[PDB]
Structure formats: C-alpha cells, structure tokens
Amino acid sequence: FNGLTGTGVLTESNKKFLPFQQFGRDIADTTDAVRDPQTLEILDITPCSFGGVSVITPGTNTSNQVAVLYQDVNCTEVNVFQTRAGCLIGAEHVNNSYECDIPIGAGICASYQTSQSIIAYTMSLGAENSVAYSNNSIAIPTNFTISVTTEILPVSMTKTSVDCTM
C-alpha cells in the first residue's frame, strides 16, 4: 500500500479513518487498519496464523507413532482432533477419561493405548469416590500400614567458577 509492506488477513474495517487517516498503526509500529490508494476504501488486518508445532510421543523404544499438536493454529488452515490448546493430527479422541500421562493442554491429555495408537481425552481428575456421609456414622481404622516414602531434595549445585579474560 504505497510502499507499505505487511502481511496478514485483509478484511474490511469499520474503523472511522478521518480523511487524513490512510493507514493505522499499532503499539509495535505495525499498521493495523489500512486503505486503498486507487479507489479509496478502508480495510482491517489480522496477521494470519502462526503457531507452535509440538510432538507428542511415547518412548521411541515403545513405539514410533507420533501425535503432532499444532498450537495457536486451527488445522482448518493446514484422525484429526480439535482441542482448545490447538489441534492434534495422529491421535484418535476417546471419550473415556483416564488418568493422563502426556499433558497436552487445556485439560486434555494423551497416552499410548489400544491396535496400539496414541489417544487423546480429557483428564480424569480421579475416581469419583463419593464418601457416604451421615449425621451419626463414623469410620474407624482397625488395621494400619507403615509405609516408607522417598523425598528427594537438591541441596547443592556444581560450584563453578569462570575466568573472564581467558
């Protein structure tokens, strides 16, 4: 637009550019709303989709199947399942919520499961154990266990030292 180079989805703008307003600008000196040089008409811009490409995999030794999650991109653009974190290619979406292994995002997780394949679902927050409350019932433990757990804590780090000139 008169030497103005820029990329993005060019829609139309209702933004009232007073006659002296040809192109708009943003907080990062990037034009947001533009106009026509030949037959003067206003337009809007939304830079079209960029996004991350993150690979979901079980261990390579376990399998070589992959679930490619495109984040910040709806694969309307590019076994495809639409999440809220983005969308997966290569993972069937099961509805049975299990305890999840590979956190995909937006509450959705994947796992390797059977015909072995990568499956995506929503996080089961746990077995919905409803405690049978009552105004006069109590639960007393009769037997117990002595369970020993391990608690790992980093204490120190490598006491490094650098010489500046060298």
């Binding site: 990062a28 991350g52 937006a106 509450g107 927050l125 077995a127 154990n129 409803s130 109590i138 433990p141």
Partner: protein, 269 residues
C-alpha cells in the same frame, strides 16, 4: 520478535546463534514450573470426593461455598464473585494452563467435600466419614477448648459461622482490592509483555525500528550493520524480559510453595 520474517535478520541472528534458544529453554522451564505449582497446590487429594445431597451439617450453611450445579462451570458462589473481581503477533504467545479453571474448581470441590465429611483423615489415608459436629469438636480439642463448649453451643456457633460467611460475601463483592495481589500479578505480566511490544519501536542507534525500512533505504552491506544494532537492542530487551520473568516466576513459586504448605496444614488438618 527480533524480525517480522526478514531473512537478512534471520542470517545476522544465526551469527549470534543460541542466544534465543537459551531464552526459549528458560521460558519453557517457567511454563513447566507453573504447571508444577498448580499441581502442588490442588492435586494433593487423590480421589475426587463428592458431597452428598444431605446437607445435615448441624446448621453450618455451606451452600455458598459448595459447588452449585446450575452454573455451567461448577463453581461456588464465592468463586463466582472472585472470578468477577479479577479481570501479540511477534512470537509473543500465551500458552493455555494445563489445568482448566473447571478442573481446578472440581479439585477445590473434592477438597471441600473431604474436609467437610472426613475432616482431615482424607489427607492422611482414605476418607473417613464423621459427623461434622464431632469433627468440629475434635478441632476444638485441638485448640484447647473441650467438646462440651461446642456441643452445648452448636446452634450459636453455626449462626456465627453463617453470618461470617455472609460478611465474607459482602467484602468480596464490594471491595475489589480484596484480590489486589492476584490482579497485581496479572498486571505485572501484561506490563512486561506490553513493554516488549513497545521495545519494537526503539531505534537502538539505527536509523529506524523497521528492518524493512532499513533494507529498503540502506544497501545490504551497511543495512547489515544497522540490523546488527537493532538485533542487539531487541535481543537485550528479550534477555532483560526473560530475566524479569524468571525472577517473578521464582517469587510466584515461593508463594505457591507457601500456598501448598497451607493447603496441606490448615485445610488437610
């Protein structure tokens, strides 16, 4: 961020190399830590407990904090008040929180159900149903007051508790600054990001802030030096930003460990 798809910048950035891979690693660590924080705080219960419909807690009205089914997001009225209180295209993206707000709501629901029906044993082992009056009597024993005080004043204590819950509702609804801390957190983050955006407008000693303008004006031999100045400036801004956010995430992790310590001690005991 450093350049909007300008290949000359891409190459002059390969001259620097890992200077941004570093940053990405750092930010990814931060994100993972955020996830860990959330899990530390809420994912301390093992099984999702569910409150029974019989609200025979001896007058202790808990409707205002137990989840309301009618709402699309199963959230307690208090949590709704809180949610109402608290309110680019240059690589700057906001990854989604792994745990949705609704899963956190269900986690707090399970925690409330456990601490109401079983009191605290649900945190040590499996949940053990116990009449809420007796659970408050054991809490009173823990304070140093004997069971007789509670059991003889159950109605009065229930009334005081319900009135206090109402007062909390009023204070949360009226004074937004009650949640100031959280707002501040959000604000800080936004501020940082906005400042990053604005750093794209500084010259850093070059002719312009648009690498396209530099390349269109100056020949590539000198446009390379100008783009080097601009790249140094923007990379320094990125380093400053990721350092700010590393420190802020360290502080957030400290506060999250404090919150987990609370959730374990007061709530679960």
């Amino acid at each position: 961020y450093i350049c909007g798809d300008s290949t000359e910048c891409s190459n002059l950035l390969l001259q620097y190399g890992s200077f941004c891979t570093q940053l990405n690693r750092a930010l990814t660590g931060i994100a993972v830590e955020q996830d860990k924080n959330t899990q530390e705080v809420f994912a301390q219960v093992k099984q999702i407990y569910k409150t029974p419909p019989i609200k025979d807690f001896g007058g202790f009205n808990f409707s205002q904090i137990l989840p309301d089914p009618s709402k699309p997001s199963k959230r307690s009225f208090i949590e709704d008040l809180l949610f109402n209180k608290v309110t680019k295209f240059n690589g700057l993206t906001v990854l989604p929180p792994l745990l949705t707000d609704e899963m956190i709501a269900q986690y707090t629901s399970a925690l409330l159900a456990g601490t109401i029906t079983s009191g605290w044993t649900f945190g040590a082992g499996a949940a053990l149903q116990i009449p809420f009056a007796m659970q408050m009597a054991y809490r009173f024993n823990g304070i140093g007051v004997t069971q007789n005080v509670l059991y003889e004043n159950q109605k009065l204590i229930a009334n005081q508790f319900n009135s206090a819950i109402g007062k909390i509702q009023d204070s949360l609804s009226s004074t937004a600054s009650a949640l100031g801390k959280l707002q501040d957190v959000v604000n800080q983050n936004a501020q940082a990001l906005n400042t990053l955006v604005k750093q794209l407008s500084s010259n850093f000693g070059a002719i312009s802030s648009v690498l396209n303008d530099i390349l269109s004006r100056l020949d590539p031999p000198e446009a390379e030096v100008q783009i080097d100045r601009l790249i140094t400036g923007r990379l320094q801004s990125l380093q400053t930003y990721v350092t700010q956010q590393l420190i802020r995430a360290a502080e957030i992790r400290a506060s999250a460990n404090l919150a987990a310590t609370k959730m374990s001690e007061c709530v679960l005991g």
